From Swiss-Prot:
The chain holds residues 120 to 423 of 427 of the full protein. Keywords: Cytoplasm, Disease variant, DNA-binding, Metal-binding, Nucleus, Receptor, Transcription, Transcription regulation, Ubl conjugation, Zinc, Zinc-finger. Residues 8-250 form the NR LBD domain. Disulfide bonds: none annotated. It comes from the Eukaryota. GO terms for cellular component: chromatin; cytosol; nucleoplasm; nucleus; receptor complex; RNA polymerase II transcription regulator complex. This is Vitamin D3 receptor. Homodimer in the absence of bound vitamin D3. Heterodimer with RXRA after vitamin D3 binding. Interacts with MED1, NCOA1, NCOA2, NCOA3 and NCOA6 coactivators, leading to a strong increase of transcription of target genes. Interacts with the corepressor NCOR1. Interacts with SNW1. Interacts with IRX4, the interaction does not affect its transactivation activity. Interacts with CRY1. Interacts with CRY2 in a ligand-dependent manner.
Length: 250
């Protein structure tokens, strides 16, 4: 059975598409405002040297901080998000931050060379740049696998925006108070996505593959938090981060 998208569901898709267009800049025109990328010689992938310099940390912390501001902006426009208490809105935003960043970064990701290309060579990021910000292979290698797997789903913008919205509005986050309200908003989004796939995505299991990407994001989020914990033990690391990054990941 292929039920047609309701007027409410079409409205939700239009709102989410407009939300994304207002919060995502595909020209990466603000990148020159971040602290500059610094790429020291590190062919060996030396942990000692990486922690000593953290050369890419001010630039990547600014990029993530910027991306979180856009995610906050996006989330505010999700149908129903504003019906939640401000305590739940912040729990949802904090717990999902790195996952939604991983999803939205897929738009700039390219399988041509397995990089995140955000304009010129200065804003072209690879595995070696994430290690230069103090992260390790236990995070970057499944992260690249996730980017390729997600890129290969060839999501329509409609599916991409619904996936981000479903990620954010998740009832199974620690500290939520009204799980039932969060679940009702998420189901409204999940049903819109299933119906959209069935009636708009041409052949050649896409909904189940998208839900699997959400479970993959959970493991990546746990690895990132463990790595952020280690990176934060580096003396004077806080000056290389941002107040927003410190609060979200602290
Ligand atoms: C460079 C690769 C990557 C990939 C997800 C990234 C970058 C940083 C970090 C960690 C950083 C940290 O742990 C710190 F401490 F190492 F900095 C912390 F999370 F704490 F910040 C990780 C783990 C991965 C990245 C690439 C492009 C990105 O965006 C392109 C476009 O989406 C932007 C405009 C918009 O989203 O509206 C973003 C947002 C991130």
């Amino acid at each position: 059975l292929r039920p047609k998208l309701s007027e409410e569901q079409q409205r939700i898709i239009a709102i989410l598409l407009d939300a994304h267009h207002k919060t995502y800049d595909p020209t990466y025109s603000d990148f020159c405002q971040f602290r500059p990328p610094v790429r020291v010689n590190d062919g060996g992938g030396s942990v000692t040297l990486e922690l000593s310099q953290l050369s890419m940390l001010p630039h990547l912390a600014d990029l993530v901080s910027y991306s979180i501001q856009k995610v906050i902006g996006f989330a505010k426009m999700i149908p129903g998000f504003r019906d939640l208490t401000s305590e739940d809105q912040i729990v949802l935003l904090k717990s999902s931050a790195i996952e939604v960043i991983m999803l939205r970064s897929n738009e700039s990701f390219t399988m041509d060379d397995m990089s995140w290309t955000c304009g010129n060579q200065d804003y072209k990021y690879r595995v070696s740049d994430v290690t230069k910000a103090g992260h390790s292979l236990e995070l970057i290698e499944p992260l690249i696998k996730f980017q390729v797997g997600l890129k290969k789903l060839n999501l329509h913008e409609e599916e991409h925006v619904l996936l981000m919205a479903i990620c954010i509005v998740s009832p199974d986050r620690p500290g939520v108070q009204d799980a039932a309200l969060i679940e009702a908003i998420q189901d409204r989004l999940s049903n819109t996505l299933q119906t959209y796939i069935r009636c708009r995505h041409p052949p050649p299991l896409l909904y189940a593959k998208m839900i699997q990407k959400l479970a993959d994001l959970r493991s990546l989020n746990e690895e990132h938090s463990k790595q952020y914990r280690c990176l934060s033990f580096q003396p004077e690391c806080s000056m290389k981060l941002t107040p927003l990054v410190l609060e979200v990941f602290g």
